[PDB]
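Troubleshooting log. The previous run stalled partway through. Resubmitting the same five chains, unchanged.
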Amino acid sequence: RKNRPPIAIVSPQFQEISLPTTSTVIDGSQSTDDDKIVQYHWEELKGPLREEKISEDTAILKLSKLVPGNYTFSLTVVDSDGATNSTTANLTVNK
Amino acid sequence: RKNRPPIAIVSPQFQEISLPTTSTVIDGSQSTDDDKIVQYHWEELKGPLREEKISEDTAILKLSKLVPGNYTFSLTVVDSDGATNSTTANLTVNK
Amino acid sequence: DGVGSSSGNWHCDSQWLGDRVITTSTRTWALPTYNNHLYKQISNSTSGGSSNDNAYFGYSTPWGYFDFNRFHCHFSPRDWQRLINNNWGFRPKRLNFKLFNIQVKEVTDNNGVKTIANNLTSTVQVFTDSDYQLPYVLGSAHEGCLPPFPADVFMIPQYGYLTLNDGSQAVGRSSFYCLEYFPSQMLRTGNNFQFSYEFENVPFHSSYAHSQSLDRLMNPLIDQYLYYLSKTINGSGQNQQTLKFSVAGPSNMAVQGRNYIPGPSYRQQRVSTTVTQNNNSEFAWPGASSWALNGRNSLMNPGPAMASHKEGEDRFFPLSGSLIFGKQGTGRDNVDADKVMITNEEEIKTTNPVATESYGQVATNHQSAQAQAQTGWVQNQGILPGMVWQDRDVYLQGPIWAKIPHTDGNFHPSPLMGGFGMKHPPPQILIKNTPVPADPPTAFNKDKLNSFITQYSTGQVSVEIEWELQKENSKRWNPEIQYTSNYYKSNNVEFAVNTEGVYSEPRPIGTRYLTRNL
Amino acid sequence: DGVGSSSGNWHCDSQWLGDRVITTSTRTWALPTYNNHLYKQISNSTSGGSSNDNAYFGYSTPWGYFDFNRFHCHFSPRDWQRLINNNWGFRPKRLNFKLFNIQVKEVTDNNGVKTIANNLTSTVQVFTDSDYQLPYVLGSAHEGCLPPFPADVFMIPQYGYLTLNDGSQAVGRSSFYCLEYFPSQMLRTGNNFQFSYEFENVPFHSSYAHSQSLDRLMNPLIDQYLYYLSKTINGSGQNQQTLKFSVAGPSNMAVQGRNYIPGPSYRQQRVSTTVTQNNNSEFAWPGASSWALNGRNSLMNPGPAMASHKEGEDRFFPLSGSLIFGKQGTGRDNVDADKVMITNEEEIKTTNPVATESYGQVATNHQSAQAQAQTGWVQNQGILPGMVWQDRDVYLQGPIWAKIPHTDGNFHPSPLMGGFGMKHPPPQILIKNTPVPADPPTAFNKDKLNSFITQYSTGQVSVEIEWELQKENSKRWNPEIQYTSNYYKSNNVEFAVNTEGVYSEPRPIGTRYLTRNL
Amino acid sequence: DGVGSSSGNWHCDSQWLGDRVITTSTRTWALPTYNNHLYKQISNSTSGGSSNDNAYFGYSTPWGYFDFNRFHCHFSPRDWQRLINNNWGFRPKRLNFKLFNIQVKEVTDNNGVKTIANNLTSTVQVFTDSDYQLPYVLGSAHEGCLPPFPADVFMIPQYGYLTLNDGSQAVGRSSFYCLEYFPSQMLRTGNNFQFSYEFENVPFHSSYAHSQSLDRLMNPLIDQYLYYLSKTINGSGQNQQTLKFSVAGPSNMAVQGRNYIPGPSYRQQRVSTTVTQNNNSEFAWPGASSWALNGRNSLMNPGPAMASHKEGEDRFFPLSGSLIFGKQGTGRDNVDADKVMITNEEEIKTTNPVATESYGQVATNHQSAQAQAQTGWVQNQGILPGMVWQDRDVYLQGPIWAKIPHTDGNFHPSPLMGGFGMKHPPPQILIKNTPVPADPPTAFNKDKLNSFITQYSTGQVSVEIEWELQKENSKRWNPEIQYTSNYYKSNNVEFAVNTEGVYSEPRPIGTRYLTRNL
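Second attempt completed without errors. Output:
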């Protein structure tokens, strides 16, 4: 009933890491909602061609086997009543 | 669940009456069903043109202001699950 | 206490004392195995399909029951004559039910010829529902009572009960009662069951007629000191209107003031035993007086105690307002009018309205110079202050008591079929042959055993009710009407067996013979 | 004391007192002749051959036994409703077992048609293993208990027991128990057996739900006086590392300090009742949580009491972590998901971890300037100090007790299938038809007699357990959740017989309905 | 008993006896009007919106409460020094709570300037929840306790409580408690409230350190009679495999057999107070040790009592495994590491594992000629037989007790935040200013009165707890470590007011100073 749309809060807006440590994390479990979030959706936009894409549904994003490049991920949260809110997260990996 | 269709039982199959006593009765409340009848429907077929038609929904049919002629009524019963059964009832009124 | 020693003697006497009668009664019963030891739900869906009025839902238990709720289970015809010719009333005080000489038989039809053997180690379990935690099917005027005649054996009825339904389907609050959830009593061939019961404080049955009408309760020689509006116009002209009051007295007994009025009415249809005086149409159900409950109609049958007919017209009986009994050897489907016994309730015409006539007139408008005095008919009349009525008669074949339904209220809870209405009537005595499995498999099987030994039970049953009596003390001079066996030669003695040994009750005997003025 | 006098009455009541309930229960049994009076060793070699996990070795005795170790053997559905809707706990205090109305039958099939006669001089011998010197097969959740419905007859299970094995072969320390080496009681048709038993001091069953979660045990308005490491970097740069501690309060309830932690876990596989949401492979056995004992694996089934699913996903059930019951008339081999009743254990999600989810995270390295904070998953977690959990629910069809195995130690010996774990549970009542030889040869033969009279036994059995109760006293304002029979028309009353007389329990009823905060 | 006679004196002593200390403590409070006398439901929806982990649903009552559940509410710093330097343990025996010198004030802001008057005829109502029928928000480590310093006044916290939720929404079993449904005590300005309470039989707090490690519990001169597998290959060749067992003794103390093992572990992340030694990423929440309950994660904080760091590395603290307190005048949002007090739990490193290190190794395969001996890490370890651990320290600022949640089971219910876990802890003392309506309309209005007189209450509160003590009797020769105030000139005396009169506790004082060998 007259629910406010959720808010997606990615803790690391600009994630920075080098090539040796590819396994990084982007936290989206801090995203708030007036009731509760039924689905966290992670999708990449600027991700360079690699072994695999990302479409994980975990609230906290675990990354692996990164290659050098610039990554851009958008977190989509879903209210219990269907309202959505998508915010973007950036990750730059060095040579 | 696998309900048997109802059975419409009109007590007077051939109702006979003269012109002085027009108010007659056709009993359809004896119609049986495996569960219960949700609607008794009375409709006339051979009824000569008169002041009014009949489409009553009472189980027991009350008639009035008859005119001489031959009447034919069909009683439609409805099972709780939608099954129907229509049987006819006859009434001849004398001069 | 053993197999070869009887567990009770045959007492069937009836001893009349100074102010009470103690009618003992013993019978032999035969209890079959019902439902094959199963509980089954029963509905109009099971029975092939019934109308909305006859829709029902219930369960049929494997239990029999004992029902001595008819007056001939205790009173011989001569005892009934003694009771009704000499007393102004009676009521039961206490009963003593005994169940003895039990003997369970085992029948084997293995070869095509049945061989009823004796099962000494098998039991029958009987319990009495003395807290009234079960549906009370007694007082429904059912069959299976102890027979009227002591000599014949009777088969114990099956115990089933109805509950709430929406059609054939069970609503959520429709109870299911397991009768194995009651502490029973397991009786072998050497055991016996007995219990005692103290009847309620029910009023005496009005075992008398009234020798005085309700409207003729007055001195026919003195006139009242009250006036009544005799005339409203003093002539035949146009503008001749007056109010002429005349004293109401013996000359005009109809209009004079009265303190009490006849009992409540609920009109029935007047059907005549001379079929040429009835209508040519089928008015049996359509012309009947019914009452609706949760949508589905149900016949009155018999409804409030009203006089059956006016004086002089014995043929007319209310369409459903009288108890109809069956003669000996009468079928149960569309028997002729000469094979049933329709009980007249005319002894109460002094206080009660005629069942086939309206209660009276009532004014239905304000008359003025322009509107005539318009008055209507009162087909049904509920209770009013000052109403006096009299309850329905009890008959030798009729019910004795009934259970007043547990409700937040009731009015005058005497059963409409006659008898004594009790909050706590004699408890239901429920008996069942304990199942005996035939042969369990040598390997375990979780399923409930379905192969039982086919066996039945038989024995004696003794009920003894002590009835209080209300002796007559009247200063009436001339002889009263009394029940007599007519002295005229006949092929068979009435209320006795014929050449085939079948005992027949030839008429319904009421109780209202002695007269008591209002 | 004779053949023609019953040795006990049918008591099946259930009387509720101020602080206890005394549930009496009587049934009729049929005891066949098992193994033809023989003791036989049984193994997977006998049964045609089984895998290494299902290898076994034991003996099958000619003895039956009585097993009233299910809750519906004593509680009617209405009694269960009274118990669980009104009490915060219950426990058995004492039982009183009676075995009466014994009657041994002799069957002869000489002509091709069987003729069950009555053997009065033949006995049945029953003894109770009150010193626990025999293998305790009760509490294994077996069949053959007293039926839920009082009316139906049941067949007494065979008593067999397993021992140690190396495959199908008996190692030297595998015991063989002769049950004729126990002092029994030899009962004819006029004798009866009864014994009393006092239950242990077992704790009350937590017959309630928790109205407060374990992690939400705090004041949602005041903040803790404790700090938590909120931030580890003060920016997004390269060499920006800090330690920023913020006070843990209502704003962030997840991180604040807690005194107690959820109970132990042992993860199960999450299988969904919507079969299109499962994997396409056969993961039934391969994906299961087992425990290995002497090499051979065995399913957990059901294992530690864990919540079945998170809130909102009712479809998911642990692969083996829940008790599954069978509906009425359900086969024993690969029945559909809609023919079984899978019991949800979600009432304990407040204290216990979800059965299909890992207990939590754990740090698995020392993070430094070079290595990221790497953390792992805790699939199974044993006991830790400060852990609070809640035991598995008992159900109307579920077990009542179990015997704690005699070992040098145990932890929290409540049965993993629900119930009360007792060192000395109700003793095993073992009954056997005493062999009756048919015709010994007229010349001596040293061999043991192998030709016996084929005969079985039947009778009644009465068990009466007195349960203590823990009444509710809560200051909760709004109404609690209570077990109700839904009021909506249906073909059959639930928990009652249908048109065939077969009694069906339509759902597993738990006990956790009333709420009690932590 | 009147307005002008005090209802109780100021007792704030602390008298040390032979085997107990009776710490009396009196404070002045100020109780405002909360919620404007209203009960309101509170949720993350009300608070603007929170994540799934921080979702909640509850009610905020207009009731205050008294919470003396911190150790400095009773012990002065000198009393704490006396307690911890001289005793091996302590536990509370009984308390005596008094509430006196009540005085209700009425404030009027009609003209823009507030005028606090005195309302003599207005009452304050206080009741103690001595049956534990309410949610127990004490022991959640909240604020609003009696201040550490006797001189300052404190404001009574609001009483709110959380219940079950599915997001922000109330599931059907979430209780609502009206605290006006409890028999309270209505106190005017001349009345007082007092109650006594007897603590449970809780064990003594281990107010000592261990002067002996768990792995060094042995004679360092004699060697064990047990052998250990020393060598598995007798050389460096290819097919050189042996089993060489050597006796385990003082030369190799690591491998010799031990009867007991360190307590359970649940690994935390090692974050260093030297921020240049941490990772550059935000690992605060992602790298944390949490436990999941009904789907939503919650920080351990602090979890099982584990040693904070190995010897020699004081900088490292577990990410959430230690209690963090705030210094005087410290904000509640992202304060620097030098504004909080992180409590070291290294006194228990003798028995407990290090919070930031794995419990140990475990073999994770069967080594053979082909597979090397592969072994894994044990990040979290539940309880095992033979485990000995030691509970978390209690601090001068830390909690005293907690309520063990009412569950079917628990393990070692000592609060993970330190203190004494009690089934029946000191009852919640709930106090509320009774509403006083301002001016009802002269015409009746069915609506509840919403215009109240704005008023508050103030008075004194006295709590006196009697603590049992466990005196030291050790044959240790050299002096023990004891808590001393360092003698070096400083601007302010520690544990005393500065020039502004604000009292500051400069460090968290534990209890484990005296040493006791294992």
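Takeaways: Chains E and C do not touch (no CB pair under 8 Å). Residues 1-518 of chain E form one domain.
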